[PDB]
């Protein structure tokens, strides 16, 4: 209000009054594979809700790729929120909060940030490409985060204009895409109530370039508006599947009348669209005005003079109109904030739904306690001040209202992370222009000013002097792991504080960015890939810090493991020479580390469930199965600590006094690692004898923890240590002829091809392969250059694999600037990483 | 040309609070769930006042459209795009 | 030397004269310890000479 | 291999009517940047100028 804004089809007063009714709000995130049409849709909708903001005839106005690099690269880099009022098929209006998410596999963190504050997902799938890598990854992520899933099969015009498939085969292609999505959903979810089918209204067909968007119901409504006497809802139930129309009986049967009879979808939906497009693009001068007369569209004379693409856009816009099918989909199959509040609190709130504050939050009552969760941070173009962005799950936030901001480490006993701040202004975020408001009720998305100071990634904003028992929302769980690592250093050491400030700012911007300072005074940035780090450095050098920053060569993060059991049972004693621990280290069973990290097992379980799980899944006896102490460096680390101390040999009651310290020592030791200060993975540590001093003045504190860490290191070093590379999963789409070239490019970088397969209904092929992360820099460029741009690849982290060599072997001599043979890659990876970290040149294997 | 504006406005009222006065002088105030082209209103959480003035609570109500005298709609619908 | 002239931000690597005629691998390699040692020995030598008589 | 290592080391350590051939580029060592896979255009598109039958 009182802000100069573009004129809309609606009026902002209606938008403001809709925000109070939480049953007319839909918090939706648009996600899909890269370049699958997710952005026109937003303008393809902004235009329909903004008469003056139109797309250029020869250039598409992205309107949500508002960034510089977004506009030149043409690649979605950051999520852009859009709040619009969209009419329904029945004429009703709902307030839509849409999250436009990037489709590149490197920027999945933005997608998770959008998924946190959303109640439903609209998955965009190219009709020609089909289900690609990121489509599967986002389906898994969405059904895991307990979000309603709907599908929009975009770019259906490619079936007509590019591939020129017969309408029946276009129907087969669409049905195959829907079936693939259904199979993926059933794979990643147990309950059946997420069946996707256009009969249920779950799936929409669209072509954003030409302003086409219809469900079965919307097309049946077009028929009904033309011929009044039909009931479009019952008509829509017969427009998909193997149901054929019988024109003699005027009834729809499950059996085709005679022969050469087409399915209902082809006869009534696909064939008219084929004919419209064919008329417009082939007979614009000859027989277009007549067909336009038949459909009831009247185009003015200067309008018929347009080029073929704008003319097709205009004709389809006249025929179809607004995107009512999309709104029908998202109203029927995406819960309102009021209804979807309960799963959101169940999943993303640390206090659980059962908590008293959890109940008031699950009601989504806007007169309750304030509970706002922010997941994105948007920087003004000056790059000085940020604006937090998130949804108000309860209560109502006001401009000028003092608030209590809780960080990610805030617990009910450690209340030092919270900080009081004052809200400056509130903007209802639209893609480009912010509409300033005075208050935002529950269930809405708000851009907050004044709370950006004490938060890094995520926050929970509550009210001071109330909500004493207010916990936080769980930090985002990302799809990938940041592996690619680069080091930064200012050109002039005098301006180091400037680079540090810029590093803090980029850490605020990118949700999954991890900036750390190593022991050697080296500043390190972790990213997902080359494009990710490229854009991070572009922001760092140009947006936040105006200084010159040197960049080191890209490198990956390694992990350390073992391959047999320790030869001699290690032991280590405290400086008091009274407390002594004996441990051995052995490799974990295959597939157990992944179970641990993926929370298939939790130490929060009672010893009974832990024991039965281990017994039935990995052949563990009850004694060892219930003997688990800790679960790696974190609560879900890929390492296990087990006590084999016999009750007779050691008194278990006294062992319990040092259990809580041996656990911490083991966690810290696995966090650091002895080889090259890297994480330890897939290692099982068994305690064999723990001699404990009776006097508590000798044990506990800073005496037993270092002994535990040292014994962990020594036990690890007996069993043959190995290094671990991160392995990337590459999916390549390329024509048939360039498949061999893809093989040739992969073979040079230690690549191993898993499978190549045709894309059904498309002339291309998909090659899926595994490549080491370190042997992947420039792989995309090599593939796109050797194939003259006809092959494109997206790489994503998959798993950890052992480096061929042996890290602890001094016999190998390495020259400074030559690639090494595989037989001793591990030795180089180990010593060079040690030199980079600033440690000694070699380890000291001992007891 | 076919369906009048007031019916559209009534369609917009779904989900809000509405008070309903039938020919029997009975006042039904509650959350309007659904409406049709005719005034058939499916509406919920009813605070119902009879002609004498007795007030009752009735969670689900479906009123025949022919038997509505007038319907009082929330004031924010005055800003509906359809009312412009 | 560092007690007399503290170097918190590692700025000692900026004013170091090198023999640019030699190849890069044959020049002096400006590691922090070596640079600090060279600066320290130069400062020690400079301190012995009073500035009024002659300067280095 | 040898040119590979040399490139690594290098990176990290009169009216002339006709152009001099010393100004040529694309004298590369990587076989992927010399024997570039030729676009076939589904076997139906062709490069401009050159004879079709060829
Ligand atoms: N043939 C065809 N092309 C389309 C259609 N819609 C969009 N495109 C084009 O396909 C490309 C997709 O660009 P965007 O729509 O911005 O991509 P996106 O889906 O937002 O994905 P990101 O790049 O990850 O942000 C652009 O060249 C569009 O102009 C469509 O319906 N048909």
Q: Which two tokens stand for residue A755?
A: 């499978």
With an 8 Å Cβ cutoff, is A11 touching chain B? yes
CB A408 within 8 A of CB A475: yes
**Can you tell me which residue has the tokens 């590691």?**
C31
What is the SS3 assignment for A529?
coil
Q: Please classify residue A646 by burial: count the beta carbons closer than 10 Å to its beta carbon, then call 0-12 exposed, 13-18 middle and 19+ buried.
A: exposed
With an 8 Å Cβ cutoff, is D50 touching chain C? no
Angle at A100 (CA atoms; ends A323, A374), nearest 5 degrees: 130
Torsion of the alpha carbons at A350, A354, A355 and A358, rounded to the nearest 10 = 70
Cα A642 from Cα B37, distance rounded (Å)? 71
CB A324 within 8 A of CB A94: no
The residue whose CB lies within 8 Å of the most ligand 1 atoms, and thus the one to mutate among A31, A34, A35, A323, is A35
Q: How many CA atoms lie within 13 A of A654 on its CB side?
A: 17
Helix (H) or strand (E) holding A515: strand A514-517
Mutate to test the interface with C, among D10, D11, D13 (most CBs of C within 10 A): D13
Cα A797 from Cα A827, distance rounded (Å)? 23
CB A705 within 8 A of CB A661: yes
Q: Is A269 annotated as a binding residue?
A: no
Cα A659 from Cα A643, distance rounded (Å)? 9
Cα A130 from Cα A184, distance rounded (Å)? 13
Q: Interface of chain A against chain D, CB under 8 Å? A: 735, 737-738, 740-741, 744-745, 748, 763, 782, 785-788, 790, 817-819
Pairing mode, strands A434-437 and A426-429: antiparallel
Method: cryo-EM
Q: How many angstroms away from the CA of A734 is the closest CA of chain D?
A: 11
Mutate to test the interface with B, among A91, A233, A322, A443 (most CBs of B within 10 A): A91
Please name which of A27, A170, A98 lies closest in space to residue A761, comparing C-alpha atoms. A170
CB A239 within 8 A of CB A264: yes
Cα A28 from Cα A122, distance rounded (Å)? 7
* Domain coordinates in residue numbering, chain B: 3-84
CB A437 within 8 A of CB A16: yes
Please name which of A534, A778, A793 lies closest in space to residue D32, comparing C-alpha atoms. A778
Q: For A8-48, where are the E strands, in sequence order?
A: 25-32
Q: Tell me, in angstroms, the distance from the centre of ligand 1 to residue A844's CA.
A: 57
List the single residue in B11, B79, B82 with the smallest CB-CB distance to A17.
B79
Please name which of B56, B54, B28 lies closest in space to residue B43, comparing C-alpha atoms. B28
Give the residue whose CA is nearest to atom 25 of ligand 1: A76
**Helix intervals (H) in A86-226:** 108-116, 133-144, 157, 167-188, 216-226
CB B17 within 8 A of CB B9: no
Resolution (A): 3.1
Test C14 with A493 for CB contact under 8 angstroms. yes
Length of chain B: 84
The D residues from 2 to 31 touching C (CB cutoff 8 Å) are 13
Q: What is the DSSP string of A107-141?
A: GHHHHHHHHHT-SEEEEEEETTT-S-HHHHHHHHH
Task: Name every chain A residue with its beta carbon within 8 A of the beta carbon of B81.
Answer: 9-11, 14, 87, 93
Q: How many angstroms away from the CA of C23 is the closest CA of chain D?
A: 8
Please name which of A354, A717, A779 lies closest in space to residue A554, comparing C-alpha atoms. A779
With an 8 Å Cβ cutoff, is A737 touching chain B? no
Please enumerate in sequence order all residues whose Cβ is within 8 A of that of A597, keeping only pairs 6 or more positions apart, or say none.
A636, A637, A638
Test B15 with A24 for CB contact under 8 angstroms. yes
- The alpha-carbon radius of gyration of chain B (Å, integer) is 13
CB A649 within 8 A of CB A530: no
Q: How many angstroms away from the CA of D26 is the closest CA of chain C?
A: 28
Helix (H) or strand (E) holding A465: none
- φ/ψ of A41, rounded to 5, equals -35, -50
Please enumerate in sequence order all residues whose Cβ is within 8 A of that of A767, keeping only pairs 6 or more positions apart, or say none.
A730, A731, A732, A734, A739, A742, A743, A746, A753, A755, A756
Q: How many angstroms away from the CA of D13 is the closest CA of chain C?
A: 6
Angle at A652 (CA atoms; ends A651, A656), nearest 5 degrees: 125
Query: Do chains B and D meet with 3 or more Cβ pairs nearer than 8 Å?
Result: no
Q: How many angstroms away from the CA of A781 is the closest CA of chain D?
A: 11
Residue A640: strand pairing partners: A684
A576-602: b (≥16 Cβ within 10 Å) or e: eeebbbbbbbbbbbeebbebbbeeebe
Q: How many CA atoms lie within 13 A of A25 on its CB side?
A: 30
List the single residue in A21, A87, A91 with the smallest CB-CB distance to B16.
A21
List the single residue in A735, A782, A819 with the smallest CB-CB distance to D32.
A782
Length of chain A: 847
Please enumerate in sequence order all residues whose Cβ is within 8 A of that of A450, keeping only pairs 6 or more positions apart, or say none.
A421, A422, A423, A424, A425
- Give the chain A residue nearest B5 (alpha carbons): A91
Atom in ligand 1 nearest the alpha carbon of residue A41: 15
CB A519 within 8 A of CB A507: no
With an 8 Å Cβ cutoff, is A496 touching chain C? yes
Give the residue whose CA is nearest to atom 32 of ligand 1: A155
Please enumerate in sequence order all residues whose Cβ is within 8 A of that of A286, keeping only pairs 6 or more positions apart, or say none.
none
Q: Please classify residue A123 by burial: count the beta carbons closer than 10 Å to its beta carbon, then call 0-12 exposed, 13-18 middle and 19+ buried.
A: buried
What is the SS3 assignment for A561?
strand
**Can you tell me which residue has the tokens 């009975």?**
B26
Residue A612: strand pairing partners: none
Which residues are near ligand 1 (CB < 6 Å)?
A 34-40, 60, 62, 75-76, 102-104, 154-155, 157-158, 207-209
Helix (H) or strand (E) holding D9: helix D2-12
Task: Name every chain D residue with its beta carbon within 8 A of the beta carbon of C25.
Answer: 13
> Which DSSP category does A554 fall into?
P
> Which DSSP category does A10 fall into?
S
Q: Is A100 annotated as a binding residue?
A: yes
The separation between the first and the last C-alpha atoms of chain A, rounded to the nearest angstrom, is 72
With an 8 Å Cβ cutoff, is A493 touching chain B? no
Torsion of the alpha carbons at A180, A238, A210 and A299, rounded to the nearest 10 = 170
Cα D15 from Cα D31, distance rounded (Å)? 37
Q: Which two tokens stand for residue B4?
A: 């009048």
Neighbours of C2 (CB within 10 A): 12
With an 8 Å Cβ cutoff, is A785 touching chain C? no
Spell out the SS3 assignment of A588-612.
CCCCHHHHHHCCCCCCCCCHHHHHH
Test C9 with A492 for CB contact under 8 angstroms. no
Task: Name every chain D residue with its beta carbon within 8 A of the beta carbon of C24.
Answer: 13
Q: Is A479 annotated as a binding residue?
A: no
Q: How far is CA A346 from CA A548, A603, D10, in A?
A: 46, 20, 59
> Which DSSP category does A349 fall into?
B
- φ/ψ of A624, rounded to 5, equals -75, -35
Test C9 with A493 for CB contact under 8 angstroms. yes
Q: Write out the CATH class of domain B3-84.
A: mainly beta
Test C13 with A493 for CB contact under 8 angstroms. yes
Test B84 with A11 for CB contact under 8 angstroms. yes
List of chains touching D (3+ CB pairs within 8 A): A, C
With an 8 Å Cβ cutoff, is D42 touching chain A? yes
């Amino acid at each position: 209000m009182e802000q100069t804004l573009p004129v809309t089809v609606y009026e902002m007063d209606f938008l403001a009054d809709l925000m109070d009714n939480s049953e007319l709000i839909r918090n939706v995130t648009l996600c899909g594979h890269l370049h699958h049409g997710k952005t026109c849709f937003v303008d393809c909708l902004i235009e329909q809700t903004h008469p003056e903001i139109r797309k250029r005839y020869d250039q598409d106005l992205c309107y949500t790729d508002i960034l510089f690099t977004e506009q030149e690269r043409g690649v979605g880099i950051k999520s852009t929120p859009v709040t619009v009022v969209l009419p329904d098929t029945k004429g009703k209006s709902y307030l839509f909060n849409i999250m436009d998410t990037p489709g590149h596999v490197n920027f999945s963190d933005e997608v998770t940030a959008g998924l946190r504050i959303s109640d439903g997902v609209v998955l965009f799938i190219d009709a020609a490409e089909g289900v690609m890598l990121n489509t599967e990854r986002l389906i898994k992520h969405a059904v895991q985060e307990r979000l309603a899933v709907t599908v929009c099969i975009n770019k259906i015009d490619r079936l007509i204009l590019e591939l020129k498939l017969p309408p029946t085969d276009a129907y087969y292609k669409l049905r195959h895409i829907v079936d693939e999505v259904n199979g993926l959903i059933s794979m990643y979810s147990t309950d059946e109530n997420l069946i996707l089918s256009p009969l249920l209204g779950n799936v929409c067909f669209s072509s954003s370039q030409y302003s086409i968007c219809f469900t079965l119901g919307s097309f049946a409504k077009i028929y009904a508006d033309t011929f009044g006497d039909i009931n479009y809802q019952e008509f829509a139930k017969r427009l998909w599947g193997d149901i054929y129309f019988n024109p003699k009986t005027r009834k729809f049967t499950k059996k085709a009348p005679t022969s050469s009879s087409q399915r209902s979808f082809v006869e009534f939906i696909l064939e008219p669209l084929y004919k419209i497009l064919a008329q417009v693009v082939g007979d614009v001068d000859t027989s277009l005005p007549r067909t336009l007369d038949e459909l009831g569209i009247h185009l003015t004379k200067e309008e018929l003079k347009l080029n073929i693409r704008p003319l097709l856009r205009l004709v389809c816009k006249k025929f179809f109109g607004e995107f009512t099918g999309f709104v029908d989909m998202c109203v029927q199959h995406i819960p309102s904030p009021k209804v979807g509040a309960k799963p959101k609190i169940e999943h993303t709130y640390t206090g659980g739904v059962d908590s008293d504050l959890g109940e008031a939050m699950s009601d989504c009552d806007p007169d309750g306690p304030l509970m706002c969760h922010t997941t994105k941070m948007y920087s003004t173009d000056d790059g000085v001040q940020f604006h937090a962005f998130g949804r108000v799950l309860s209560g109502t936030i006001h401009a000028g209202q003092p608030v209590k901001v809780l960080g990610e480490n805030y617990t009910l006993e450690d209340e030092e992370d919270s900080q009081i701040c004052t809200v400056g202004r509130l903007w209802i975020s639209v893609a480009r222009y912010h509409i300033e408001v005075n208050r935002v009720p529950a269930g809405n998305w708000v851009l907050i000013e004044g709370v950006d100071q004490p938060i890094v990634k995520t926050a929970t904003i509550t009210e001071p002097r109330g909500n004493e028992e207010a916990q936080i929302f769980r930090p985002l769980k990302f799809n990938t792991t940041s592996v690619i690592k680069i080091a930064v250093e200012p050109v002039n050491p005098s301006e180091l504080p400037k680079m540090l400030d810029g590093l803090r700012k980029v850490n605020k911007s990118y949700p999954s960015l991890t900036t750390k300072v190593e022991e050697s005074g080296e500043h390190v940035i972790l990213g997902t890939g080359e494009l990710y780090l490229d854009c991070v450095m572009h922001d760092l050098r140009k947006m936040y810090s105006e200084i010159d920053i040197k960049v080191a060569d890209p490198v990956v993060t390694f992990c350390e493991t073992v391959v047999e059991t320790s030869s001699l049972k290690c032991f280590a004693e405290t400086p008091n020479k009274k407390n002594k621990i004996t441990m051995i280290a052995e490799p974990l069973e295959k597939g157990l580390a992944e179970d641990i990290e993926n929370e298939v097992v939790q130490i929060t379980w009672n010893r009974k469930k832990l024991g039965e799980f281990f017994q039935t899944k990995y052949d563990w006896d009850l004694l060892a199965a219930r003997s688990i102490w800790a679960f790696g460096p974190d609560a879900t680390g890929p390492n296990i600590l087990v006590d084999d101390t016999l009750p007779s040999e050691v008194d278990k009651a006294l062992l319990g006094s040092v259990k809580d310290s041996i656990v911490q020592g083991f966690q810290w030791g696995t966090r650091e690692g002895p080889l090259c200060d890297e994480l330890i993975r897939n290692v099982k540590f068994k305690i064999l004898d723990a001699v404990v001093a009776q006097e508590p003045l000798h044990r506990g504190g800073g005496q037993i923890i270092p002994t535990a860490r040292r014994v962990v290191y020594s036990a690890f070093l007996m069993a043959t240590p190995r290094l671990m590379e991160p392995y990337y999963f590459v999916e390549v789409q390329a024509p048939a002829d360039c498949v061999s070239a893809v093989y040739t490019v992969l073979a040079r970088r230690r690549g191993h091809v898993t499978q190549d397969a045709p894309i059904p209904g498309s002339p291309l092929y998909t090659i899926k392969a595994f490549i080491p992360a370190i042997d992947s820099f420039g792989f995309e460029t090599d593939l796109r250059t050797h194939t003259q741009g006809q092959a494109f690849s997206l790489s994503v982290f998959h798993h950890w694999q052992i480096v061929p060599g042996d890290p602890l072997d001094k016999s190998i001599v390495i020259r400074p600037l030559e690639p090494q043979p595989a037989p001793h890659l591990a030795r180089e990876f180990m010593i060079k990483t040690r030199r980079r970290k600033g440690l000694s040149e070699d380890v000291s294997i001992s007891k | 040309m076919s369906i009048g504006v007031p019916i559209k406005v009534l369609h917009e009222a779904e989900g809000h609070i509405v008070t309903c006065e039938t020919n029997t002088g009975e006042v039904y105030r509650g959350k309007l769930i659904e409406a049709e082209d005719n005034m058939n209103c499916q509406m919920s959480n009813i605070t119902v006042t009879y002609r004498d003035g007795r007030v009752a609570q009735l969670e689900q109500v479906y009123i025949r459209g022919s038997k509505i005298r007038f319907l009082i709609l929330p004031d924010m619908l005055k800003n509906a795009p359809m009312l412009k | 030397y560092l007690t007399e002239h503290p170097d918190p931000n590692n700025e000692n690597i900026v004013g170091y004269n090198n023999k640019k005629c030699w190849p890069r691998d044959a020049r002096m390699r400006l590691m922090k310890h070596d640079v600090n040692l060279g600066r320290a020995v130069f400062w020690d030598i400079k301190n012995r000479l009073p500035r009024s008589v002659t300067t280095v | 291999k040898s040119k590979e290592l040399h490139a690594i080391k290098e990176r990290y350590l009169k009216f002339v009517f006709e152009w001099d051939a010393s100004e040529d580029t694309s004298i590369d060592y990587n076989p992927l940047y010399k024997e570039r896979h030729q676009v076939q255009l589904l076997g139906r598109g062709f490069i401009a100028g050159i004879d079709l039958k060829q």
